Design a protein around this ligand. Structure first.
Ligand SMILES: COc1cc(CNC(=O)Cc2cn(CCCC[C@H]3C[C@@H]4Cc5nc6cc(Cl)ccc6c(N)c5[C@H](C3)C4)nn2)ccc1O
Ligand SMILES: COc1cc(CNC(=O)Cc2cn(CCCC[C@H]3C[C@@H]4Cc5nc6cc(Cl)ccc6c(N)c5[C@H](C3)C4)nn2)ccc1O
Ligand SMILES: [Cl-]
Ligand SMILES: [Cl-]
Lengths: 532, 532
């Protein structure tokens, strides 16, 4: 009864799940779109046709077709991110965790997974919404969206493969939440979207996109922003990559209709097998099929929208991790290894810089090298390693986010900024990688509250603080509880630019997050590359 | 008798001068060239014709015609550098201080004054060679040379104003020392030339010039090097400035012969009155008439000579002061004043950068600004002031000297490098100016040994250490006395790049003097400006 919900598309039957020492309801694998299969591959999603009978929402759905990381087989640190369900193009489902007893009209949070727009699953253990829904009394939704070529192959001008359809998948799930979350006890006028990495970029893209803005109230962006250099391409570059994808699969390339028809006859794994072959440069932190600046989802360039205030004005909470670059260097840069401290030679440093800034000319590469090299101590393998780590994280995550924060705050209604720099005590990744891209998520989703997962008591307390910040922000637009005597997370303002550290020690307020390096990345290096 | 010396140009009669609690002999105002007056203005010097009778060498000679600093009338800090004798184009004389009793064959040191190639006198109180000659038992020579347009007006191709004649003045004095210092008790095979600022650049130019190299044994360069950006111009730029000088004086400009003839009829002060009007840029630390890269005194570019080892291979001792830039900012940059702490606004900082790097385009100016700005604290007037101080000293003195040191040491026979960072207790200049350009000279010449000058006992001890370093280097090629248990000043080597601080505390050895900034000035910024 508590597990049966009538929605506008039909009835759904959930399941009662244990969480800590209580229970909540879960509605898993609810369809929000028609299966984008067959001649619907690459096309914009269509709403799910209403169904007769009762939809069995007791088990997780399929994951979308995607590249699977096999670099460390059996290693939990990498396999925890891989699809844990069967992959299928039939994958547009969402999941809902609902407090028990069912609320009347409570705050909703919608999670958008990341994964470079080429990977991601709503069903990962680390995305289990039951601890957040139970602890903070929110309705927690996780959506899914097509990734890779399936979600982002872009042949602008065509209506069969227009690009951005993964983002339209996200939007269709938000539309379904807007239309139906009331029946689960959610308040559709108090929806917060939040996401990490490409999901953080996606959140920012719905803030910008006129077609998405009305479908949520406020937003949280973790380690990703819409202006990140990896997060979008021009329509010309998307077309070049789509044509190169067909060339890899022996397709007729004489027209969009012939190319799209050829690509639609291929099995999913044949696209995945060649997807990485279309990148224009030898690079790390660059992905083949990503959002395209198309003039429809995004009416103009991202920079001109941010400059003019052409975006949703609301409250945002966002931040970054200390060592965003380390994951990408481990997988893609010579000299880095999982089982060594990865001290980097001068030659491997120069190779890494070239991989990390693929669009740079030799003068640009010299500028990056000078900015990040201690010339009193240039053969220090630890400083070279940490310098490359900083280059990758500053260029790809931190400095684009700081540019976004400063543009947004001029027109927005409240900005809260964090710097997550706690390394978990039970981390299976080597110590040189520090505070890794993606490893704040387990604190946001409350995994340290689970005794068997071997976190410390301080880490459980940190997780509870973070979950309460997130859910209080979602509820009110302010992560701070009023009338409480805890230290206050201050607003980020244009003038004072305050942020907080997120770790196990007492809260410290700082100003101008990595301002020196972000002047280099956001102002000087673009000017240098444009003049040369 | 001890005061009478027969030389190859004739007899000279010196004077007995008191020094501390003893006496030495002084031979002041000995002519080494014919007076470069009349139709000899701008021409290469001619040897002084031998004279009958006894030359009265008991009084200082005239100083060369030059610009006189009147920015702080009556202020000893600036007036101590001005001519202290009557100015005259009849000014090619040298001075000799000789220990008593007259030595047989002792080390000779020849001082070359600086002053931006536009000023300087051999007769300044701070250049009095009697303390060094007495204390260290050397024969101390100070020469003179034409400065300004008189010494450096350059119309390449003409034999009436070929350029570089001030450097040929220096060379003619060195030739006279080579030919005659034996009669004063000097060893002509153990001559060290030393000089500060433009005199340091000049010393380096005689190391490079094939026509000068045979006239001395080893060399000391203080706060100046031949490759400094202010120390030379091309023949085209020298010609442009000579023509502009004539335009300022209503000269016929249709041929070299007409221009030179017009310039030779002008009184000296009319040239001096307009000399600063010919500079191509709004600048500081740039001078109108300087050595020209002519293909004769310098056979090729300074850089190609340093790269190929086309220079005298010997021992060198050289170094810089901590705050070389402060003097130039005080006189030439907005926001700096003698009687205030000169806290610099953001706007005056940007004006100062533009003055300090006049050849830079806007991208180059942004690169300099980023390198020297703390963007966590960019409105700190003390940091802006000290940042400009560092820009001026790094660009104009320290980084060119470090480029010279590293090129020279590849082929040379021994390099000793110092960093003078002691601020004298009795300095009359404000504290913001720090360790000023030129203020190591009083320690080299032993002024702290004079009780009435109000130095401390530690500063007398520092002066004695420096004088002993200099004279022991002059004597042996090594500033360290063998068999002594004092801490050793190590050789500067290509690999370890060691240097010492010179101050009142116990000697400390460091490595890679200002290497971070000099990579910027010597490698990155030239590459940036060449590509743009
Ligand atoms: C793998 O083999 C090669 C790899 C390369 C180098 N490849 C690349 O540079 C392509 C690339 C791939 N990526 C990864 C994008 C990030 C996707 C995810 C983001 C989210 C957080 C996260 N963090 C992880 C951290 C570690 Cl240590 C390990 C796995 C992580 C992970 N899967 C995720 C997911 C995916 C969610 N960046 N660049 C070259 C040649 C190769 O043969
Ligand atoms: C003075 O009026 C103006 C001045 C300017 C600015 N002028 C300039 O930038 C031209 C310039 C002149 N200079 C000086 C070159 C250095 C020459 C001397 C070097 C040696 C060491 C020395 N140090 C001194 C330190 C102080 Cl604090 C004061 C005087 C010093 C001094 N005369 C010397 C001499 C000269 C020997 N650099 N740039 C613009 C407009 C003006 O009306
Ligand atoms: Cl680390
Ligand atoms: Cl200072």
């Amino acid at each position: 009864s508590e597990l049966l919900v009538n929605t506008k598309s039909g009835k759904v039957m959930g399941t009662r799940v244990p969480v800590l020492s209580s229970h909540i309801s879960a509605f898993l694998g609810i369809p929000f779109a028609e299966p984008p299969v067959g001649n619907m591959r690459f096309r914009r999603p269509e709403p799910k046709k209403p169904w007769s009978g009762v939809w069995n929402a007791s088990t997780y759905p399929n994951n979308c077709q995607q590249y699977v990381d096999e670099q460390f087989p059996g290693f939990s640190g990498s396999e925890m991110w891989n699809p844990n369900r069967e992959m299928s193009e039939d994958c547009l489902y969402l999941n809902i965790w609902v407090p028990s007893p069912r609320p009347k009209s409570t705050t909703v949070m919608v999670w958008i997974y990341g994964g470079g727009f080429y990977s991601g699953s709503s069903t990962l253990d680390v995305y289990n919404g039951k601890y957040l829904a139970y602890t903070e009394e929110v309705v927690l939704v996780s959506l899914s969206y097509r990734v890779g070529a399936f979600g982002f192959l872009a042949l602008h001008g065509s209506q069969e493969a227009p690009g951005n359809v993964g983002l339209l998948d996200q939007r269709m799930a938000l539309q379904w939440v807007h239309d139906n979350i009331q029946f689960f006890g959610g308040d559709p006028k108090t929806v917060t979207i939040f996401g990490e990495s490409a999901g953080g970029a996606s959140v920012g893209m719905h803030i910008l996109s006129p077609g998405s803005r009305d479908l949520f109230r406020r937003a949280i962006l973790q380690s990703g922003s819409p202006n990140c250099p990896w997060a979008s391409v021009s329509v010309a570059e998307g077309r070049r990559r789509a044509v190169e994808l067909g060339r890899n699969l022996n397709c007729n390339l004489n027209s969009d209709e012939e190319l799209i028809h050829c690509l639609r006859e291929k099995k999913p794994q044949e696209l995945i097998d060649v997807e990485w072959n279309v990148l224009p440069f030898d690079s790390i932190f660059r992905f083949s099929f990503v959002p395209v600046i198309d003039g429809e989802f995004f009416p103009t360039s991202l920079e001109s929208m941010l400059n003019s205030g052409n975006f949703k004005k609301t409250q945002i909470l966002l931040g970054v991790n200390k060592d965003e670059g380390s994951f990408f260097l481990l997988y893609g840069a010579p000299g880095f290894s999982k089982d060594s401290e990865s001290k980097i030679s001068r030659e491997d440093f120069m190779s890494g810089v070239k991989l990390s800034v693929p669009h740079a000319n030799d003068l640009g590469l010299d500028a990056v090298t000078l900015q990040y090299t201690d010339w009193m101590d240039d053969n220090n393998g630890i400083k070279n390693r940490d310098g490359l780590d900083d280059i990758v994280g500053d260029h790809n995550v931190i400095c684009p986010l700081m540019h976004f924060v400063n543009k947004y705050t001029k027109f927005g209604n409240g900005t809260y900024l964090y710097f997550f720099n706690h390394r978990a005590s039970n981390l299976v990744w080597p110590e040189w990688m520090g505070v890794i891209h993606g490893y704040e998520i387990e604190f946001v989703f409350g995994l340290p509250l689970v005794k068997e997962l071997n976190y410390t008591a301080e880490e459980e307390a940190l997780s509870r603080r973070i979950m309460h910040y997130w859910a209080t922000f979602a509820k009110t637009g302010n992560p701070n509880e009023p009338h409480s005597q805890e230290s206050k997370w201050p607003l980020f303002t244009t003038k004072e630019q305050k942020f907080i550290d997120l770790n196990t020690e007492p809260m410290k307020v700082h100003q101008r997050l990595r301002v020196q390096m972000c002047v280099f990345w956001n102002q000087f290096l673009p000017k240098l590359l444009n003049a040369t």
